[PDB]
Design a binder for this molecule. Structure first.
Ligand SMILES: CCCCCCCCCCCCCCCC(=O)O
Ligand SMILES: [Cl-]
Length: 133
């Protein structure tokens, strides 16, 4: 299953094309202004087969808890109510969010010791890189 190298606390060190990713989700300017200035912290823990991903920022905190392959109700940082699933493809943690007939994905894979999150929406791609502490 999920490699134990995901487990721990991660810190954003790079974000590319985040403003345009938020634009695609319908995020307003003022909210985007703060989402760009945010340097979140992502904690990934595991209790049994239930994986938890927690995001901590001064602006918004979030937390999801799921079993791989099982749909679950999620409330996103921008307050979307999504029916989401997390799958594992070649050691990549791929999260899909569906709402209002729309859909976006967050793919998280480890690269040379760093967690790389790919955000995708209608051909708009954002790349966020985290370093472990
Ligand atoms: C915690 C980030 C604050 C941004 C709030 C503005 C609304 C945008 C929400 C989009 C969520 C994108 C998160 C990508 C996954 C990650 O980088 O861990
Ligand atoms: Cl922050």
């Amino acid at each position: 299953g999920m490699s134990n190298n995901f487990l721990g606390t991660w810190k954003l060190v790079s974000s590319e094309n985040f403003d345009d990713y938020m634009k695609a989700l319908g995020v307003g300017l003022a909210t985007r202004k703060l989402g760009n200035l945010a340097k979140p912290t992502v904690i990934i823990s595991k209790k049994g087969d239930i994986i938890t991903i927690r995001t901590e920022s001064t602006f918004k905190n979030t937390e999801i808890s799921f079993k791989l392959g099982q749909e679950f109700e999620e409330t996103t940082a921008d307050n979307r109510k999504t029916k989401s699933i997390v799958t594992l493809q070649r050691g990549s943690l791929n999260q899909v969010q569906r709402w209002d007939g729309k859909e976006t994905t967050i793919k998280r894979k480890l690269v040379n010791g760093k967690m790389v999150a790919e955000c995708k929406m209608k051909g708009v791609v954002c790349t966020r890189i985290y370093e472990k502490v």
